Amino acid sequence: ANTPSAKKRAKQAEKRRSHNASLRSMVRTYIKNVVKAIDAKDLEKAQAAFTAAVPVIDRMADKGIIHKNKAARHKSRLSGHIKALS
Amino acid sequence: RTLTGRVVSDKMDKTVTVLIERRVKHPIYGKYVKRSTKLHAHDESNQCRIGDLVTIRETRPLAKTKAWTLVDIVER
Amino acid sequence: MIQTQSMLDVADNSGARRVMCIKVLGGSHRRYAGIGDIIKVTVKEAIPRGKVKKGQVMTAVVVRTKHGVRRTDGSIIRFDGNAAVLLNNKQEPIGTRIFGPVTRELRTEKFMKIVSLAPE
Amino acid sequence: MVTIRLARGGSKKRPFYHLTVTNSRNARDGRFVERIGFFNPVATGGEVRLSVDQERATYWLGQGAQPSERVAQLLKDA
RNA sequence: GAAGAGUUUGAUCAUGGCUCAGAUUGAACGCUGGCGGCAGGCCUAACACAUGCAAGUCGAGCGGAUGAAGGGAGCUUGCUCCUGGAUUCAGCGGCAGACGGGUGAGUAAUGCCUAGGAAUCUGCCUGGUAGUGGGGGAUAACGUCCGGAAACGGGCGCUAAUACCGCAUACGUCCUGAGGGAGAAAGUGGGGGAUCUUCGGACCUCACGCUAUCAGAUGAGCCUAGGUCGGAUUAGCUAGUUGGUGGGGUAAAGGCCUACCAAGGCGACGAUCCGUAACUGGUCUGAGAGGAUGAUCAGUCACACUGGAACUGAGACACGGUCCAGACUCCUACGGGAGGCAGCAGUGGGGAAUAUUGGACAAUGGGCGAAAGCCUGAUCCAGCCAUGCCGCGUGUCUUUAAGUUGGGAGGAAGGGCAGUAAGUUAAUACCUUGCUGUUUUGACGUUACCAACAGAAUAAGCACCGGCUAACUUCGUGCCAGCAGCCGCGGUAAUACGAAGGGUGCAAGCGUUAAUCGGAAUUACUGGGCGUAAAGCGCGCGUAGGUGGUUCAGCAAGUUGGAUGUGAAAUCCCCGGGCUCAACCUGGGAACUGCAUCCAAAACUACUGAGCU
RNA sequence: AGGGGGACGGUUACCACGGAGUGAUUCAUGACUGGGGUGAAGUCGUAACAAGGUAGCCGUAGGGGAACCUGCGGCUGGAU
């Protein structure tokens, strides 16, 4: 059978998965709204929308749910097309 | 850091394939045979036609089955 | 299943995929068999290696009918598909697994092995 | 994880060590990073005890490897 | 550093196959057995698996369970109210479980091996660079209820932190790189005299922790070139295929994912399909070339009943994890549940054939820990088996082995402790730590090994004997019965077959069944053939290709020399060191004919150019 | 109040296993057959080896219980 050393981490993994599922989805809905902002072509809300997102993309990267250079790309992808709105 | 082959197909943009030929020995037969090697070379500006001779450089891969770029058209 | 020539799925583990009733057992001019009744089958279709082979006169308990079985309040329980469990000459099941539901008219003194394996 | 460690060669009831530099990701007797000199606690006449060369032994202490427990008090035999 | 015989014929010669000497193995089988040391022991069913064990660790990370003692109050030594704190350890939390271990099923190519290449992460480790402040919401244990015989589920209600979430804060670190924006942490224990007081706290101080980065070590991931199994009685395959950009995405490049644009890509140097197989260092026979080959050993790969899938984590698509599906199996009190030995034993079952439900963490590791230590079927080491490989013994009046007794090293590095000195200290006040000398203690195998004792008491077997094997009477049997590798032998004096009677091979082993290479120039690169022995298409035109008259000059691809990194360690080859000797063990080198890079060379070849007949 | 943001939802692509139809390609088996090999050889026979008692042999059509005959082009591996 299995050991209570592993039965303890049965709870310690899936409960931790549930916290890491939400915080991960709390990232990518902020990026979707600043792609909805570019797809609406309105800079006048797009500037205010991803400056709400950048404190979330790296704050999650700082605590090891995701990696810190996944943030570094998405901070450089969204800015390289908001500049294209000109 | 220098590999040389003659151009055999150029009908795609930014990409060319050459025959980097060689003549090396057969191990148990002794007769030096030719062994053709058909690399893919990436062109930045697509200036190579069929029958040209080029040299290439290795870098990070530029596509699948392509990790070599164009250095210079040596001759034609 | 209910009568002869009727063709019916196989609810237990090993062997057949389709059996056909060739005789309803019980009485003399007995013409129907519902859930809990004993029929005589032949194996019309089977898996490549199992405990029964194609073309084999065997005995099976009817576990799951489309005509259904009625309860004492008047309620009926009625399935989508005909199915039997093949038996040996002990009238004990051959397979070690039962697939699909069964009814509580089958948890008698002879067929509670089928009930104890079923995912009812 | 990088470690300088006694590693059993030799025969049964005939110990011989290599003082391997290992990774603690492997076994005792496989995939060492470096063998610096040996050890032999059954040393009798003509057999040198330990071939510890401090030319390389400085480097893994310099690059951050550790004695295990006994490897510290073989360097204390100097 | 290389040995051939026998056999086609009345005889010969030549071509050509057979059988034979040898050495070998992971060994069987038939026989008979005294011992030591190192070894090795499912080659078949990646077949199914009862049973115990193979990774639990931590209270000095946090709440909460239980009360060693001791000093006292009553009753009067029975008892508890207390006071206290010794201790444990199921529930949270950190780390590990991604290692050690096993097996070789899948894989014909990016798996392995050799060389190189850059567009990346790495917990613990090691050097610095900057930093540990202030808060907030939950949550198990616990309380009870419900369902259940139990296993377990799932309803609310409590509480914690080295568990989590904001806020503060930014030397790097990320984005824009103009300016600017962004985002971190946790505290616990051993102490401490002055001021704040409950010198519980605060502050001071080291120790383990914690964080934000850089450089490194150590792993781990991509990418290219090379080669890597049998077939054409498999010749066409290919559409996300081959490129292009926009985006999307991976820790990281990349049709990896995507939309649309174009019609490319692969392949006769063997594509695709088909059968087969982990690969390599190496191993075995060999003069070598090679050929065969991957058991112990070590590197990489791959798998975990079968298949798909992510999750958590530094690291997995995780062997004693979860999820789903399948096959199978099991407990049921019919409510509901559980299992995966290719982990060590062991069991069936298959097979010619392969071991003990062992001892201990004392050595070496690891895994947690401030440290003590705690666990480990990895390991150290033991039974079992002539299974090799060595030695050794069975007597020529010694007593070796064996057995009795008495002795007797080496495997132990250190831990406890209580001084002693040191240097971080703001205060060598004090803790904490490294040093020193003494004391205390801990060996699974418990012995090897030395020296006494009784007495040859306890030890040999096997196969052959016609030839070319220089071991070579007869008795029984009569073309019977049989033996044998090639000839053959037996049909009535049998050196060929069955005993006895002797020898001989080499010995606790001897033989024969099987497989490998060899001799085999019998697939001939080294190193063979083709008028008649086997073998010239019936001959042409000619595609790829193989090779190419002639001269100067040039190139430096092949060729040639040196340079440097390697070609892991092991194995082997010499010199040694040791076991009392040999195996075995290692130290030193030698070896590794290889690979690319680098410069030097220009007789010849290709290529380049002008020519020459 | 609520908002932001999560969670269960709803359904959309992707896919393992399963299903269905129709084919390929392999392996085992199959009544019954057809040659092949080795035997032991009973048999019609004499087919080859001599100029083998009709010279053999090869291709091919053609024909016939068989070991076998003519033709057309073919060869001496054909000798007096």
C-alpha of C43 from chain center: 13
Nucleotides on chain F within 7 angstroms of protein Cβ = 5-8
Q: Contact at 8 Å (CB) between C44 and C29?
A: no
**CATH fold group of domain A2-86:** Methane Monooxygenase Hydroxylase; Chain G, domain 1 (1.20.58)
Hey, what are D45's tokens?
Answer: 């006449």
Q: Measured between alpha carbons, how far is C45 from A9 in angstroms, rounded to an integer? A: 47
DSSP state of D45: T
Q: Measured between alpha carbons, how far is A14 from C107 in angstroms, rounded to an integer? A: 40
Nearest CA to C3 among C44, C40, C55, C36? C40
B36 touches strand E (CB under 7 A): yes
C1' of E551 to CA of B32 (Å): 28
A45 touches strand E (CB under 7 A): no
The residue ranges of every structural domain in chain A are 2-86
DSSP state of C104: G
At residue D58, the 3 state secondary structure works out as helix
Domain with D32 in it: 1-78
C-alpha dihedral sign at C72, C74, C75, C79: positive
Q: Measured between alpha carbons, how far is B35 from B22 in angstroms, rounded to an integer? A: 6
Buried (b) or exposed (e) across C47-70, using 16+ Cβ within 10 A?
A: eeebbbeeeeebbbbbbbbeeebe
Domain with B69 in it: 1-76
Nucleotides on chain E within 7 angstroms of protein Cβ = 37-39, 55-57, 90-94, 96-97, 99-101, 116-121, 123-126, 164-167, 173-176, 181-185, 211-213, 216-219, 223-227, 242-245, 247-256, 262-267, 269, 289-291, 297-300, 311-314, 318, 320-322, 327-332, 334-335, 338-340, 363-367, 378-382, 410-414, 435-436, 525, 545-547, 557-559, 568-569, 577-579, 584-588, 597-598
Domain count, chain B: 1
CATH of the domain at D62: 3.30.1320.10
Q: Measured between alpha carbons, how far is D2 from D64 in angstroms, rounded to an integer? A: 7
Give the type of residue at A39: D
Task: Give burial (CB, 10 Å; 0-12/13-18/19+) of B67.
Answer: middle
Task: Give burial (CB, 10 Å; 0-12/13-18/19+) of D3.
Answer: middle
Domain count, chain D: 1
Q: Which domains does chain C have, with CATH numbers?
A: 1-120 (2.40.150.20)
Q: Contact at 8 Å (CB) between A46 and A84?
A: no
The vertex-C41 CA angle with C40 and C45, nearest 5°, equals 175
Residue that the structure tokens 């059954």 belong to:
D42
C1' of E492 to CA of D62 (Å): 99
H/E stretch holding C113: helix C112-117
Q: Measured between alpha carbons, how far is B55 from B36 in angstroms, rounded to an integer? A: 16
